[PDB]
Each structure stands twice: as structure tokens, then as C-alpha cells.
Write a protein that binds this ligand. Structure first.
Ligand SMILES: C[C@@]1(c2ccccc2)C(=O)C([C@@H](c2ccccc2)c2ccc3ccccc3c2)=C1O
Ligand SMILES: [Zn+2]
Length: 223
């Protein structure tokens, strides 16, 4: 998160910190959010050979009793996810066990467009600048939902599939390490962080989760 503030600790109890493990390089990192006690929603580009999930974190470098480090037993990457266009960048992680509900850990389901100009909030442990590591503490930022023309320069952006997020006038943005984190508008999840520019100039592109709610429900019901 660039240009944000430190979250009040444990104020976003659905937030998931993901470590993405692959066989030929070091760990990479994503966000996500708990939508059922045994399912986390995140981005498909965060898939790996294995993934761990930490719930209940604030400062991710300091172990505490609120942490729940949970095994993922299966990754459900959207079957139409396209690595070239980045369409359908959405994935469900099924947890081995159900998370414990605590003050620090709870679910955020979302129901069955929010107009541009509205302000929304996104949180994450991602990089705080192009040349900076991920934040040790959960950060959040208020961003403007944009008209889709603001994201035209992402040639594969599509208004019905994706949200365009972050006024280009500001540095405020989701960034690398924040992928998969929820965008909340008036407390309701509307998007997850997908991609943006290497140089971090907003807007960034978020998956429009409303489009995917039927698919999410079909995975949840079969598993
Ligand atoms: C850390 C990283 C990652 C983490 C775990 C596994 C793989 C990659 C991840 O996310 C990305 C890419 C990306 C996005 C989409 C597809 C590939 C790479 C990215 C670049 C610019 C952005 C700008 C604004 C916000 C998010 C951005 C995300 C990574 O590199
Ligand atoms: Zn704590």
C-alpha cells in the first residue's frame, strides 16, 4: 500500500497474509480475505505449488496469540484465468481446517455497480513504494473509484470484469504484495487487487467480484 496509513490493529479481521511457495524461487507474498471459515478469496496470479495463510495478523514480523497459521489443502483458480490478458484473476483457497472465530479473525461474505467517484478502502502488507519492501504492519488507503476510461491504457482492462481504482493525480495505490486484498466500499467488498504499473502510478486494476459471485458459490457448494 502506497500513501496509506497503519490500520488499527485487528480492525480488519477477515484479512489474510499469504506466502506463495514455488519450487524454483523464494517465497512471494499476497493478500486475500476470509469469506467462509475454511475459504480465502484472493487473485489467481498468486497460485503456487503451496500456499500458507496467516490470519489474525497486524505486525507480521511479531508472533502473537491472535495468529492462526493455516494450511491450504486445495487451490481453485478460475478456470478461465488468462495469463496474458489477466482476465478472471480470481482464486479460492480451501483451508484444511476451519479458522477459529476470535475478535481478531472473522469472515467477510459479500452479497448479490458502485458508481465512480465513490471512495473505497483497500488494505495490505505490500510494498510502500517501488523501491521499498512490504510493510511489516497492515496498511490501508482510501482510493477513488474511477470511470473505466481512466484504465484504458491497460489494453486488456474491461469495465464489466474489473474496477479501475485510484485517482491518477495521487500516489495513493494498492501495489505489489497487496494482490488479492479486498476493496471495500461502505464496508462491502467490491473488488480484489489484481495488477497495475511497475512504476506504481495509479489507477490499478481490481477484479470486479460481483461478476464472479455465481462461480464462487458453485465452488463453495461442491467443496
Ligand atoms: C508481487 C507479485 C506476485 C506475488 C505472488 C505471486 C506472483 C506475483 C504481484 O502481485 C505482482 C504483479 C503481477 C500482477 C498480475 C500478474 C502477475 C504479476 C503486480 C505488478 C504491479 C502491480 C501494481 C499494482 C497492484 C498490484 C500489482 C501486481 C508480482 O510480481
Ligand atoms: Zn495483536
Amino acid at each position: 500500500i502506497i500513501g496509506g496509513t497503519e490500520s488499527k490493529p485487528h480492525s480488519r479481521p477477515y484479512m489474510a497474509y499469504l506466502e506463495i511457495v514455488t519450487s524454483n524461487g523464494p517465497s512471494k507474498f499476497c493478500g486475500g480475505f476470509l469469506i467462509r471459515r475454511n475459504f480465502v478469496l484472493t487473485a489467481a496470479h498468486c497460485a503456487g505449488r503451496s500456499i500458507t495463510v496467516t490470519l489474525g495478523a497486524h505486525n507480521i514480523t511479531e508472533e502473537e496469540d491472535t495468529w492462526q497459521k493455516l494450511e491450504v489443502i486445495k487451490q481453485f483458480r478460475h478456470p478461465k484465468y488468462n495469463t496474458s490478458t489477466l482476465h478472471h484473476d480470481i482464486m479460492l483457497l480451501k483451508l484444511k481446517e476451519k479458522a477459529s472465530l476470535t475478535l481478531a479473525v472473522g469472515t467477510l461474505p459479500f452479497p448479490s455497480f458502485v458508481p465512480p467517484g465513490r471512495m473505497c478502502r483497500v488494505a495490505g502488507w505490500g510494498r510502500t513504494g517501488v523501491l521499498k519492501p512490504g510493510s511489516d504492519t497492515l496498511q490501508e488507503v482510501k482510493l477513488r473509484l474511477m470511470d473505466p476510461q481512466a484504465c484504458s491504457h491497460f489494453r486488456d482492462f474491461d469495465h464489466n470484469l474489473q474496477l479501475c481504482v485510484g485517482n491518477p493525480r495521487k500516489t495513493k495505490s494498492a501495489f505489489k504484495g497487496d494482490s488479492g486484498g479486498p476493496l471495500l466500499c461502505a464496508g462491502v467488498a467490491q473488488g480484489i487487487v489484481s495488477y497495475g504499473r511497475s512504476d506504481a502510478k495509479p489507477p490499478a486494476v481490481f477484479t470486479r467480484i460481483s461478476h464472479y459471485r455465481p462461480w464462487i458459490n458453485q465452488i463453495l457448494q461442491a467443496n
